[PDB]
Amino acid sequence: MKVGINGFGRIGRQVFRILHERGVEVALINDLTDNKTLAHLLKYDSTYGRFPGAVGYDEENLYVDGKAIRATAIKDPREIPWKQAGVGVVVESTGVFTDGEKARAHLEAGAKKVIITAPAKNEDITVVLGVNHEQYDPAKHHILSNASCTTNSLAPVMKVLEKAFGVEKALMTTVHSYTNDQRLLDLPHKDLRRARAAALNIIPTTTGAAKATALVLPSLKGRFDGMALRVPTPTGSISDITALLKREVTAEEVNAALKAAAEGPLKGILAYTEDEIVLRDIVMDPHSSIVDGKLTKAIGNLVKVFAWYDNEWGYANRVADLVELVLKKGV
Amino acid sequence: MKVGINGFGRIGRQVFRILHERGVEVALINDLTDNKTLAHLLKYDSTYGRFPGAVGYDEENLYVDGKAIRATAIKDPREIPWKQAGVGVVVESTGVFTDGEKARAHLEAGAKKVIITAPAKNEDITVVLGVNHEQYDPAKHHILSNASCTTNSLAPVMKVLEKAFGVEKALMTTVHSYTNDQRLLDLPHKDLRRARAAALNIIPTTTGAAKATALVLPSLKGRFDGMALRVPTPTGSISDITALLKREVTAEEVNAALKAAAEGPLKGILAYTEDEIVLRDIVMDPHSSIVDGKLTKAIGNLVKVFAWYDNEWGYANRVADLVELVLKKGV
Amino acid sequence: MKVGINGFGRIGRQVFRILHERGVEVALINDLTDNKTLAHLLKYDSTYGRFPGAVGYDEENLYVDGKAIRATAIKDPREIPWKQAGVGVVVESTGVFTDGEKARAHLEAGAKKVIITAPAKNEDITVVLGVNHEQYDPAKHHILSNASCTTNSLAPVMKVLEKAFGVEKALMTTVHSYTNDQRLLDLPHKDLRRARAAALNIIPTTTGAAKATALVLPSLKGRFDGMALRVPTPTGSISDITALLKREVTAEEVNAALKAAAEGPLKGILAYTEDEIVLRDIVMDPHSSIVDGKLTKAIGNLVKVFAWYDNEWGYANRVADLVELVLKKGV
Amino acid sequence: MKVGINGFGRIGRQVFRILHERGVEVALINDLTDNKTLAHLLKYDSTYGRFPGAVGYDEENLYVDGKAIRATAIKDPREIPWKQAGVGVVVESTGVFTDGEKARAHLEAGAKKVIITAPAKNEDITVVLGVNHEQYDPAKHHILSNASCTTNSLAPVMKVLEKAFGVEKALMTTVHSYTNDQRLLDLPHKDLRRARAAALNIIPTTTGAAKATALVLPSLKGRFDGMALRVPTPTGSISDITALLKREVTAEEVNAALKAAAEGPLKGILAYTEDEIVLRDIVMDPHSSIVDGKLTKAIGNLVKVFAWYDNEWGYANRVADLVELVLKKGV
Ligand SMILES: NC(=O)c1ccc[n+]([C@@H]2O[C@H](COP(=O)([O-])OP(=O)(O)OC[C@H]3O[C@@H](n4cnc5c(N)ncnc54)[C@H](O)[C@@H]3O)[C@@H](O)[C@H]2O)c1
Ligand SMILES: NC(=O)c1ccc[n+]([C@@H]2O[C@H](COP(=O)([O-])OP(=O)(O)OC[C@H]3O[C@@H](n4cnc5c(N)ncnc54)[C@H](O)[C@@H]3O)[C@@H](O)[C@H]2O)c1
Ligand SMILES: NC(=O)c1ccc[n+]([C@@H]2O[C@H](COP(=O)([O-])OP(=O)(O)OC[C@H]3O[C@@H](n4cnc5c(N)ncnc54)[C@H](O)[C@@H]3O)[C@@H](O)[C@H]2O)c1
Ligand SMILES: NC(=O)c1ccc[n+]([C@@H]2O[C@H](COP(=O)([O-])OP(=O)(O)OC[C@H]3O[C@@H](n4cnc5c(N)ncnc54)[C@H](O)[C@@H]3O)[C@@H](O)[C@H]2O)c1
C-alpha cells in the first residue's frame, strides 16, 4: 500500500515534498519529461527553495537520499506500472484527468484509490478536509477529488458563518496568483483572458469554486457564486467573501466566531489573525484558509470577510493530508 | 485667467498633457525638483510614452514647442508666484495639501480657484463629474476636490443602481495598481502594509472611497464601505461592487441599465462593455468607469458589478475636465 | 504575388500589423487556433495596444476593415492552401519550421518564397537588413531567414566597429525580455533554466546570436560569442558588446563613429542616442539597434557598447522590410 | 564593547538578524521611525520571511525574545546615545553618512569603531573580506567601509584572475535587483534613470564598483571599469566580467582556477558551481561571489566570467563578518 504521483508538476512536486517530510513513501512518479528534468525541478524550486535532501536520477529512477523511486514518462494512464510497483493510492495531478470517467484508468492498471487534485467530474466524492471528510466511505469511494484551492479557502469560512449566523446569499471574489495554466505573453487559450500576458495584467476569469463549495455545503445550493481575478504574483491568494447573513451582526462578532473555529474545530485547516500582513507573509503556510481579521467589514447583515491562502503549498498539505486519511482507512 | 499646477508628478504631468492637447494653457508649474528633471519626466513617461511635442528647459522655465512656462521649486504654497503669472485656477496635486485649511494658501498668493486632486478636507465641494457637478456654485465654491479615482469609478455605478433598482446596502473591493505612495521594498510607512514591497505583494489597504461616494450620493450615507487591494501593476484598477438592491433583479437587467446610462446621461464618464478584456486593455482610457458586463453576477437582489478604470489617465481627464468647468463658470 | 503568414503569434501578428499599415496584403493566415481566438489576439494586444482597425471573423476568414483573409488551423505545412490563395511569399513564424529541410514544404504547396523569422538551418541565406541584404539573389535564394533579434542588434554595430577600428575579438551579453518560449512557473523545458519562472528570475541562457553574427560578417568567424540573460520584462532588450579593437580608441571616437553610421549608411536600421533612456522608452521602436551613447566605455583598445532593441516590434519591422525586398525582386 | 546599528533598513535589519543568529548582541538601534514600525519590519520581511524569534516593542525599546534593545529615532548622529548604552562598534547603514567626514560623528558621541555599509569617502579603510582584510590595523583604522555588494562580488574574482593569469584590462557589467534607492513609478531623482519605474524597466546606471575594486586591488588601477543594469527583481544580482588576461587561456582553465580558490583560500567568500541555476536559487546565499561555471566563456586571452550574489543577504553576512573581526581585534 504505497503512494504514486501522476503529474510531477507544481502541485505534484509540493505534495511529494510534504509526503517525504512526513515519512510517507512514494513508489512511482510519472510525468512527460525525462527523469533528468524531474530531478532538477524537485531540487531547485523558484518559490519554496531547494529540496531538503539529496536528489539523483538515472534512466529509470529518481533517488531521494538513496531510496529509489521509479520515474516514468507514460502519457497514457492505463499504461502506468502502478501494478509492478505496488502503488495503492495515486495522486492524479496532471490537470488532464479531472474526471473519474478517465481517471478510472489508474485503477484498471493497479491502483486501489485515486485522488484528483482539482475540481473533478464523475468522481466518487469531492472532499474538503474540515468540512466533509468524516463523510468518506472507504468501501464505496475510490476516486476522490480534493476540490480546488479556492474551494478549500471558502468552505471553512462558509461553514462557520452558517453554524453561527446562517447564510442566505453570498457572492465572492478571489484575487489569485497566476498558474501554469495561464500565458506568459498573449497566446492562444480557450479562455480569452487567461490568454493574455499573466505578469502584465489583472485577469478576470470564471471560477466554479463557489458553486463547488455549494456541494460540500448543500446549504448554499444555488445561492453562492463568485469571480476570480488573476494577478501578477507567483503564489498566494485571497478570497473576498460577501455574504448576506440571516441576522444583523458586527464585524467583531464575525471574527471571534471565525477565530473560535480556528483555535477549535477547524484548527489546522482554518486560521485567524489580526496581524498587518501582506501576500509574501502567507506563502508556504500549511493552512487552507487564514482569516484577515482587520479587513472584516459588516454593515448590518451584509458582511465581507477575507481569507488568505497559498493555492500551492496549503492545498498540497491538504492533498497529502487526504492521502494519509485514505491510507488510514484504506481498502 | 490661466491654469497652474502644483505637484508636477504622476497626476500633475498627465493633467498637463491633457490640458495641452485640449488647448488650455498652463502658466506656471511648481514642484520640488530642478526644471531639468521636470522636463525629462514630462518628455519620457514609462506608462504613456513620449510627450507629444518638443520639451526644453532653463533655470527659470520649461518650453512646450516654444511657449514658455514658469517652473519653480517652492515647497511653500503661500510663496508661489501665482500672482505675477496671472494663474487663476490651480491644480493642487502634490498630495500634501489635501485640505483647504492649508490649500487655501494658494488663494492668499494669487489664485482665484483651487482644485485638489485627491480626497480633500475642509474644501468647499468634492465633485464627481457626472454625479454632482451641476451642483457647482462659482460664487460660493473656490476650493474644490475631484475626489479619488476609486470614488470616480464607484459613483457613476452606484448612481445608476439607485435610479433603477435602488440601493439598500453595498460593500465594495478595489484591486488597484500601486502608486508612488507605496514602497519598492520593505520600508517605513504609516500604513504597515503599504510599507511592504509593492511589486512583490498583494497589499490590503483601507479606502474611504466608498464612504466618500456616500457624500456625492447622500443616499448611501452610513450604508456603503469598502476595501482596497494593492497589486503588482503600474496602472489600471478594477472596482468590485457588491450591492443589495431593493428588489430581486437579474444580471442582464443590471447591465442593460448601466449600458443605458453609458450610452446616454453618463456618456463620456461611464462606459459599458462585453468584450473579453484585461487590465492592459483599459490603460489610458479617458473614462471614469468601464463596466465589464460579462462579469456581472446576480443572485436575486444581491448583485456584483465590476468597473475598470485607469486611476491615472482617466482621473486626470476628470481633473482637466474640472478645470474646464471652473474656467467656463469662472470668478 | 501575395503574402502569407504561418504562425500568427507574437511575431506573426506584429508583422501583420506592419504589413497592413504599409499597404501590403496578406492573403492567408495559418495557426493552430480557431479564427475566433486569432481575431481576439490581433484586436487586443497587451504590449502594443488595440489593433488600428476593425477586426471580424467567421468559420473560414478574418476581416480587416472588410477585406477578407483566409484563416486556417492546419498544423502540417505541406497541407496549407498557399496555392488556392495565390500566396507567393510566406512568413514562417511558428518557431517550429526553422530549417529549410522542413520549411521547404511551403514551396511544395504553392509559395514561391519563404522567410523564416528566426535563426534557420539549411536555408538559402540568412540576411540582416543593413549588413548583407544587397547580397540577395532572387534566382538562387528562395528560403531565407531574417536571423534573430539579437543578431539584428549586434550586426549593425560589429559592422561599424570593423570598417572604422577593426575588430580582433568580441564577447557580448544580452539582457533580454522573456518570450513565450520560456515558462510562467517552474515547468519542463529542454533548457533547464528557461524552465524556471520567467517573471521571477534572471535566467542565463545560451545564444548563438554572436556566432550567427559571424556569418553575416565572416570577419568575426570563430572570434565572437556571447551569453543571454532573460529578465522579467515583456519586451525590449539591450546588447552588451565588449570588443577588443585593432587600435586604442576613446569612447567619444566610438560614438561619433556609430553615430555617423546611424545618420548615414545604416540609417533606419541603426540609431544613436545620448538621451537618458530606460527600457520602456524603446518599446515599439522600429530600429534594429539603438546605441546608448552615454553608456559607451573604452579602456584603450577594449571597448564596451550598448544597443537597445525591441526584440518584437523592431525585428518585425525587419521581417516586413524583408518581405518588401523579396516582393520588389520577386520570382 | 557592544554593537549598534544606525539605519535599521534593508541592510540594517539583515545584519541584525545575522548578528543575532551568531550570538552578537546589538545594544541600540536608531532609525527615523517609531519602534512600532521597526518591530513590524523586522518581524515580517518580504524577501527572507518571518524573523526567527519573538518581536516586541514599547516607547523606548525593542525586545528580541525578552532581551531589550534601545530603539531611537534621532536623525542627527552626534545625538545618538551610543555612550549611555556602551555601544562600541556602529554599523552605519542609513545610506546618508557614507563619508567619515560626517560618520565621524558616531565617535564624538561614544562609539569606538564605525563600519559604513556602502562605498565610503574619507574613511580609514575600505575592506573586502577575502581580498584585503588582513590589512586591518585596529590602532590606525576606526572608520571602515565594507565597500559595495558589487565590489564584494568582483574583487574575489579579479583577485583569482590576477594570481593565476594576470589581468591587463577588464570591463564589467552587473545586472542588479532594484533597491530602495530607485523609484516605484516615474519620479524625481538625481539620476535620470533610477527615476523611472523600477519594476517596469531595465535601467542603466553608473557604478563605481569596478574602480572601487581597483583600490582593494591596486593592480587594476585605471584599468577596470563597469556599468550597471537595474532589472525588475527584488534581490539577487549577477556580475558580468569581461577581462583581457596576460595570456591565452581556456574557459576550463579559468574555472578550475576560480574553483580552486572557492574550495581553498577564498572559501566562505567565493563559491563555484556548475549547476543549472537561476536568480531565485541564490537568494539568501551567504557568499560574496558565486561563479556560474557553465557560463564561462573564453576566446584566447579575452575571458568572460559570471558571478551571482545576493546584494542583500550576502553583503550583510560580510558586514556582520566585519563586526566580528573589529570586535576580535577591538580597541
Ligand atoms: N496551481 C495551483 O495552485 C493549483 C491548486 C489546486 C489544484 N491545482 C490543480 O492541480 C493540477 C496540476 O496543477 P499544476 O499547478 O501543478 O500545473 P503544472 O503545469 O505544473 O502541471 C503538472 C504537471 O503535469 C504534467 N502532465 C501533463 N500532462 C501529463 C500526462 N498526460 N501524464 C503525466 N504528466 C502530465 C505536466 O507536464 C506538469 O509537469 C491542475 O489540474 C490544477 O488545476 C492547481
Ligand atoms: N496615483 C493615482 O492614481 C492618483 C489618482 C487620484 C488622485 N491621486 C492623488 O494625486 C496626488 C498626487 O499623486 P501622484 O500619483 O502624482 O504622486 P507623486 O508621487 O507622483 O506626487 C506628485 C508630485 O508632487 C511633488 N511634491 C511633493 N511635495 C511637494 C511640495 N511641497 N511642493 C510641490 N510639489 C511637491 C512630488 O515631488 C511629485 O513629483 C496625491 O494626493 C494622490 O493621492 C493619485
Ligand atoms: N519573441 C521574439 O522577440 C522573437 C524575435 C525574433 C524571432 N522570433 C522567433 O519567431 C518565432 C515565433 O516567435 P513568437 O514570439 O511569436 O512565439 P509564439 O509563441 O507567439 O508563437 C507564434 C505562433 O506559432 C503558432 N504555432 C505553433 N506551432 C504551429 C504550427 N504547427 N502551425 C501553425 N502555427 C503554429 C503558435 O500557436 C503561436 O500562436 C520563433 O521561432 C521565435 O524564436 C521571436
Ligand atoms: N540594497 C543593497 O543591496 C545594498 C548593498 C550594499 C550596501 N548597501 C547600502 O546600505 C545603505 C542602506 O541600504 P538599504 O538597502 O537598507 O536602504 P533603505 O532604504 O532600506 O535604508 C536603510 C534605513 O535607513 C534609514 N535612514 C535614513 N536616514 C536616516 C537617518 N538620518 N537616521 C537613521 N536612519 C536613517 C531609512 O529610513 C531606512 O529604514 C545604503 O547606503 C546602500 O547603498 C545597500
Side-chain angles (χ1 to χ4, degrees):
Chain A
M1 189 63 103
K2 304 179 299 180
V3 176
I5 292 175
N6 191 51
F8 205 60
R10 277 327 268 164
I11 297 301
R13 291 191 298 281
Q14 300 323 312
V15 173
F16 174 72
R17 191 204 283 217
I18 300 167
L19 290 177
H20 177 60
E21 302 198 63
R22 278 186 187 162
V24 179
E25 55 174 54
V26 169
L28 165 52
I29 289 174
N30 178 50
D31 194 288
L32 298 171
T33 194
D34 48 35
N35 293 13
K36 180 181 182 49
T37 308
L38 286 187
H40 188 75
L41 292 178
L42 183 67
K43 181 179 179 180
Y44 298 108
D45 182 293
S46 303
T47 290
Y48 307 106
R50 213 191 158 304
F51 185 77
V55 173
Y57 74 100
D58 69 20
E59 65 206 273
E60 284 190 353
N61 288 130
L62 271 189
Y63 303 102
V64 180
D65 304 315
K67 186 96 220 211
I69 314 177
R70 262 293 267 175
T72 65
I74 309 169
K75 61 185 60 181
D76 181 66
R78 178 73 184 82
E79 294 180 344
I80 298 180
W82 296 125
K83 63 107 62 172
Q84 47 181 303
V87 175
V89 195
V90 174
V91 180
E92 168 51 55
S93 58
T94 76
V96 171
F97 304 125
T98 53
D99 84 307
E101 172 171 274
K102 239 180 180 173
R104 235 104 193 184
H106 285 306
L107 295 169
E108 63 182 51
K112 273 290 195 128
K113 284 286 180 146
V114 176
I115 287 178
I116 298 182
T117 64
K121 181 172 70 170
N122 297 308
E123 81 288 358
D124 292 348
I125 186 179
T126 284
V127 58
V128 174
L129 300 167
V131 179
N132 72 335
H133 62 300
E134 288 177 11
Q135 193 189 303
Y136 167 62
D137 191 302
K140 308 213 297 310
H141 309 168
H142 305 296
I143 274 194
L144 314 74
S145 155
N146 219 317
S148 66
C149 46
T150 312
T151 296
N152 272 278
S153 75
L154 290 181
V157 165
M158 278 329 234
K159 179 185 188 72
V160 171
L161 283 179
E162 182 67 57
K163 175 185 171 182
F165 313 104
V167 175
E168 186 192 307
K169 299 194 290 191
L171 282 172
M172 74 79 209
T173 292
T174 183
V175 183
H176 202 276
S177 283
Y178 48 60
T179 57
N180 268 314
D181 175 59
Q182 310 189 217
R183 301 293 181 263
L184 186 52
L185 284 174
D186 290 353
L187 209 58
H189 199 293
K190 59 174 169 46
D191 179 323
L192 298 189
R193 298 189 181 206
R194 331 250 278 188
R196 315 300 292 284
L200 263 41
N201 289 288
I202 285 179
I203 306 179
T205 192
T206 63
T207 176
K211 295 177 177 176
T213 313
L215 304 191
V216 305
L217 290 189
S219 318
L220 293 65
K221 188 205 169 189
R223 39 195 63 248
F224 188 39
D225 190 28
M227 186 59 98
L229 295 178
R230 287 307 186 73
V231 299
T233 50
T235 186
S237 294
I238 187 168
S239 295
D240 191 13
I241 288 180
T242 307
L244 195 64
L245 300 182
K246 283 179 181 169
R247 77 181 199 61
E248 314 192 308
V249 301
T250 63
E252 304 81 314
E253 290 191 83
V254 176
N255 277 174
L258 289 163
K259 174 179 185 177
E263 41 176 284
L266 280 159
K267 199 180 181 185
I269 273 56
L270 178 96
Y272 171 91
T273 194
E274 299 200 310
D275 290 319
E276 315 259 61
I277 67 175
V278 297
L279 190 57
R280 218 56 194 50
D281 292 315
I282 57 81
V283 164
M284 209 197 240
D285 184 290
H287 293 78
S288 275
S289 191
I290 303 168
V291 173
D292 195 312
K294 296 198 140 56
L295 321 188
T296 322
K297 284 289 175 289
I299 288 184
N301 73 307
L302 189 60
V303 72
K304 180 174 292 298
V305 176
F306 295 92
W308 287 113
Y309 69 104
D310 185 341
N311 50 295
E312 264 181 26
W313 194 259
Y315 181 79
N317 262 281
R318 292 300 85 77
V319 173
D321 267 19
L322 188 53
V323 172
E324 308 293 279
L325 206 65
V326 171
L327 289 176
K328 171 180 179 174
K329 303 194 165 200
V331 299
Chain B
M1 189 63 103
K2 304 179 299 180
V3 176
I5 292 175
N6 191 51
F8 205 60
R10 277 327 268 164
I11 297 301
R13 291 191 298 281
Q14 300 323 312
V15 173
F16 174 72
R17 191 204 283 217
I18 300 167
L19 290 177
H20 177 60
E21 302 198 63
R22 278 186 187 162
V24 179
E25 55 174 54
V26 169
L28 165 52
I29 289 174
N30 178 50
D31 194 288
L32 298 171
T33 194
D34 48 35
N35 293 13
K36 180 181 182 49
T37 308
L38 286 187
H40 188 75
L41 292 178
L42 183 67
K43 181 179 179 180
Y44 298 108
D45 182 293
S46 303
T47 290
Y48 307 106
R50 213 191 158 304
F51 185 77
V55 173
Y57 74 100
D58 69 20
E59 65 206 273
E60 284 190 353
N61 288 130
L62 271 189
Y63 303 102
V64 180
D65 304 315
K67 186 96 220 211
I69 314 177
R70 262 293 267 175
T72 65
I74 309 169
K75 61 185 60 181
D76 181 66
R78 178 73 184 82
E79 294 180 344
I80 298 180
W82 296 125
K83 63 107 62 172
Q84 47 181 303
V87 175
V89 195
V90 174
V91 180
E92 168 51 55
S93 58
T94 76
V96 171
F97 304 125
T98 53
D99 84 307
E101 172 171 274
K102 239 180 180 173
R104 235 104 193 184
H106 285 306
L107 295 169
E108 63 182 51
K112 273 290 195 128
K113 284 286 180 146
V114 176
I115 287 178
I116 298 182
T117 64
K121 181 172 70 170
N122 297 308
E123 81 288 358
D124 292 348
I125 186 179
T126 284
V127 58
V128 174
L129 300 167
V131 179
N132 72 335
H133 62 300
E134 288 177 11
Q135 193 189 303
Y136 167 62
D137 191 302
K140 308 213 297 310
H141 309 168
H142 305 296
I143 274 194
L144 314 74
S145 155
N146 219 317
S148 66
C149 46
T150 312
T151 296
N152 272 278
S153 75
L154 290 181
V157 165
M158 278 329 234
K159 179 185 188 72
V160 171
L161 283 179
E162 182 67 57
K163 175 185 171 182
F165 313 104
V167 175
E168 186 192 307
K169 299 194 290 191
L171 282 172
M172 74 79 209
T173 292
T174 183
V175 183
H176 202 276
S177 283
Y178 48 60
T179 57
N180 268 314
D181 175 59
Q182 310 189 217
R183 301 293 181 263
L184 186 52
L185 284 174
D186 290 353
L187 209 58
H189 199 293
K190 59 174 169 46
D191 179 323
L192 298 189
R193 298 189 181 206
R194 331 250 278 188
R196 315 300 292 284
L200 263 41
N201 289 288
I202 285 179
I203 306 179
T205 192
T206 63
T207 176
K211 295 177 177 176
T213 313
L215 304 191
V216 305
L217 290 189
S219 318
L220 293 65
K221 188 205 169 189
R223 39 195 63 248
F224 188 39
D225 190 28
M227 186 59 98
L229 295 178
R230 287 307 186 73
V231 299
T233 50
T235 186
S237 294
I238 187 168
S239 295
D240 191 13
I241 288 180
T242 307
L244 195 64
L245 300 182
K246 283 179 181 169
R247 77 181 199 61
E248 314 192 308
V249 301
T250 63
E252 304 81 314
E253 290 191 83
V254 176
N255 277 174
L258 289 163
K259 174 179 185 177
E263 41 176 284
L266 280 159
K267 199 180 181 185
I269 273 56
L270 178 96
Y272 171 91
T273 194
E274 299 200 310
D275 290 319
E276 315 259 61
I277 67 175
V278 297
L279 190 57
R280 218 56 194 50
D281 292 315
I282 57 81
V283 164
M284 209 197 240
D285 184 290
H287 293 78
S288 275
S289 191
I290 303 168
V291 173
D292 195 312
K294 296 198 140 56
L295 321 188
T296 322
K297 284 289 175 289
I299 288 184
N301 73 307
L302 189 60
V303 72
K304 180 174 292 298
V305 176
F306 295 92
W308 287 113
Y309 69 104
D310 185 341
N311 50 295
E312 264 181 26
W313 194 259
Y315 181 79
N317 262 281
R318 292 300 85 77
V319 173
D321 267 19
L322 188 53
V323 172
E324 308 293 279
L325 206 65
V326 171
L327 289 176
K328 171 180 179 174
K329 303 194 165 200
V331 299
Chain C
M1 189 63 103
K2 304 179 299 180
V3 176
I5 292 175
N6 191 51
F8 205 60
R10 277 327 268 164
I11 297 301
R13 291 191 298 281
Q14 300 323 312
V15 173
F16 174 72
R17 191 204 283 217
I18 300 167
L19 290 177
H20 177 60
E21 302 198 63
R22 278 186 187 162
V24 179
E25 55 174 54
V26 169
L28 165 52
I29 289 174
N30 178 50
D31 194 288
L32 298 171
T33 194
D34 48 35
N35 293 13
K36 180 181 182 49
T37 308
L38 286 187
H40 188 75
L41 292 178
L42 183 67
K43 181 179 179 180
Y44 298 108
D45 182 293
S46 303
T47 290
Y48 307 106
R50 213 191 158 304
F51 185 77
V55 173
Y57 74 100
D58 69 20
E59 65 206 273
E60 284 190 353
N61 288 130
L62 271 189
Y63 303 102
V64 180
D65 304 315
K67 186 96 220 211
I69 314 177
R70 262 293 267 175
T72 65
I74 309 169
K75 61 185 60 181
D76 181 66
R78 178 73 184 82
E79 294 180 344
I80 298 180
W82 296 125
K83 63 107 62 172
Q84 47 181 303
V87 175
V89 195
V90 174
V91 180
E92 168 51 55
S93 58
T94 76
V96 171
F97 304 125
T98 53
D99 84 307
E101 172 171 274
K102 239 180 180 173
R104 235 104 193 184
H106 285 306
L107 295 169
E108 63 182 51
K112 273 290 195 128
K113 284 286 180 146
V114 176
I115 287 178
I116 298 182
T117 64
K121 181 172 70 170
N122 297 308
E123 81 288 358
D124 292 348
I125 186 179
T126 284
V127 58
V128 174
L129 300 167
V131 179
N132 72 335
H133 62 300
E134 288 177 11
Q135 193 189 303
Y136 167 62
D137 191 302
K140 308 213 297 310
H141 309 168
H142 305 296
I143 274 194
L144 314 74
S145 155
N146 219 317
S148 66
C149 46
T150 312
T151 296
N152 272 278
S153 75
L154 290 181
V157 165
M158 278 329 234
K159 179 185 188 72
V160 171
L161 283 179
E162 182 67 57
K163 175 185 171 182
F165 313 104
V167 175
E168 186 192 307
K169 299 194 290 191
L171 282 172
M172 74 79 209
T173 292
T174 183
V175 183
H176 202 276
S177 283
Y178 48 60
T179 57
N180 268 314
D181 175 59
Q182 310 189 217
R183 301 293 181 263
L184 186 52
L185 284 174
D186 290 353
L187 209 58
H189 199 293
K190 59 174 169 46
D191 179 323
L192 298 189
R193 298 189 181 206
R194 331 250 278 188
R196 315 300 292 284
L200 263 41
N201 289 288
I202 285 179
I203 306 179
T205 192
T206 63
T207 176
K211 295 177 177 176
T213 313
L215 304 191
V216 305
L217 290 189
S219 318
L220 293 65
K221 188 205 169 189
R223 39 195 63 248
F224 188 39
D225 190 28
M227 186 59 98
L229 295 178
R230 287 307 186 73
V231 299
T233 50
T235 186
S237 294
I238 187 168
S239 295
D240 191 13
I241 288 180
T242 307
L244 195 64
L245 300 182
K246 283 179 181 169
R247 77 181 199 61
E248 314 192 308
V249 301
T250 63
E252 304 81 314
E253 290 191 83
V254 176
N255 277 174
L258 289 163
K259 174 179 185 177
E263 41 176 284
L266 280 159
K267 199 180 181 185
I269 273 56
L270 178 96
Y272 171 91
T273 194
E274 299 200 310
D275 290 319
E276 315 259 61
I277 67 175
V278 297
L279 190 57
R280 218 56 194 50
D281 292 315
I282 57 81
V283 164
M284 209 197 240
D285 184 290
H287 293 78
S288 275
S289 191
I290 303 168
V291 173
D292 195 312
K294 296 198 140 56
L295 321 188
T296 322
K297 284 289 175 289
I299 288 184
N301 73 307
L302 189 60
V303 72
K304 180 174 292 298
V305 176
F306 295 92
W308 287 113
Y309 69 104
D310 185 341
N311 50 295
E312 264 181 26
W313 194 259
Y315 181 79
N317 262 281
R318 292 300 85 77
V319 173
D321 267 19
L322 188 53
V323 172
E324 308 293 279
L325 206 65
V326 171
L327 289 176
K328 171 180 179 174
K329 303 194 165 200
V331 299
Chain D
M1 189 63 103
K2 304 179 299 180
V3 176
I5 292 175
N6 191 51
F8 205 60
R10 277 327 268 164
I11 297 301
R13 291 191 298 281
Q14 300 323 312
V15 173
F16 174 72
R17 191 204 283 217
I18 300 167
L19 290 177
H20 177 60
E21 302 198 63
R22 278 186 187 162
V24 179
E25 55 174 54
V26 169
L28 165 52
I29 289 174
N30 178 50
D31 194 288
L32 298 171
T33 194
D34 48 35
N35 293 13
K36 180 181 182 49
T37 308
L38 286 187
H40 188 75
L41 292 178
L42 183 67
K43 181 179 179 180
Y44 298 108
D45 182 293
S46 303
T47 290
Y48 307 106
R50 213 191 158 304
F51 185 77
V55 173
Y57 74 100
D58 69 20
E59 65 206 273
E60 284 190 353
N61 288 130
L62 271 189
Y63 303 102
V64 180
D65 304 315
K67 186 96 220 211
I69 314 177
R70 262 293 267 175
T72 65
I74 309 169
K75 61 185 60 181
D76 181 66
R78 178 73 184 82
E79 294 180 344
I80 298 180
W82 296 125
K83 63 107 62 172
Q84 47 181 303
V87 175
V89 195
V90 174
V91 180
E92 168 51 55
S93 58
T94 76
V96 171
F97 304 125
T98 53
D99 84 307
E101 172 171 274
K102 239 180 180 173
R104 235 104 193 184
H106 285 306
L107 295 169
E108 63 182 51
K112 273 290 195 128
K113 284 286 180 146
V114 176
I115 287 178
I116 298 182
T117 64
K121 181 172 70 170
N122 297 308
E123 81 288 358
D124 292 348
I125 186 179
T126 284
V127 58
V128 174
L129 300 167
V131 179
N132 72 335
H133 62 300
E134 288 177 11
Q135 193 189 303
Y136 167 62
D137 191 302
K140 308 213 297 310
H141 309 168
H142 305 296
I143 274 194
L144 314 74
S145 155
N146 219 317
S148 66
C149 46
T150 312
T151 296
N152 272 278
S153 75
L154 290 181
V157 165
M158 278 329 234
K159 179 185 188 72
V160 171
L161 283 179
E162 182 67 57
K163 175 185 171 182
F165 313 104
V167 175
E168 186 192 307
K169 299 194 290 191
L171 282 172
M172 74 79 209
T173 292
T174 183
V175 183
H176 202 276
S177 283
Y178 48 60
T179 57
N180 268 314
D181 175 59
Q182 310 189 217
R183 301 293 181 263
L184 186 52
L185 284 174
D186 290 353
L187 209 58
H189 199 293
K190 59 174 169 46
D191 179 323
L192 298 189
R193 298 189 181 206
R194 331 250 278 188
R196 315 300 292 284
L200 263 41
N201 289 288
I202 285 179
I203 306 179
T205 192
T206 63
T207 176
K211 295 177 177 176
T213 313
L215 304 191
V216 305
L217 290 189
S219 318
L220 293 65
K221 188 205 169 189
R223 39 195 63 248
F224 188 39
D225 190 28
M227 186 59 98
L229 295 178
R230 287 307 186 73
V231 299
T233 50
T235 186
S237 294
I238 187 168
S239 295
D240 191 13
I241 288 180
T242 307
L244 195 64
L245 300 182
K246 283 179 181 169
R247 77 181 199 61
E248 314 192 308
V249 301
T250 63
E252 304 81 314
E253 290 191 83
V254 176
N255 277 174
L258 289 163
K259 174 179 185 177
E263 41 176 284
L266 280 159
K267 199 180 181 185
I269 273 56
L270 178 96
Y272 171 91
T273 194
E274 299 200 310
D275 290 319
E276 315 259 61
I277 67 175
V278 297
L279 190 57
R280 218 56 194 50
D281 292 315
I282 57 81
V283 164
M284 209 197 240
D285 184 290
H287 293 78
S288 275
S289 191
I290 303 168
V291 173
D292 195 312
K294 296 198 140 56
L295 321 188
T296 322
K297 284 289 175 289
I299 288 184
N301 73 307
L302 189 60
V303 72
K304 180 174 292 298
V305 176
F306 295 92
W308 287 113
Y309 69 104
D310 185 341
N311 50 295
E312 264 181 26
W313 194 259
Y315 181 79
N317 262 281
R318 292 300 85 77
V319 173
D321 267 19
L322 188 53
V323 172
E324 308 293 279
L325 206 65
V326 171
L327 289 176
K328 171 180 179 174
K329 303 194 165 200
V331 299

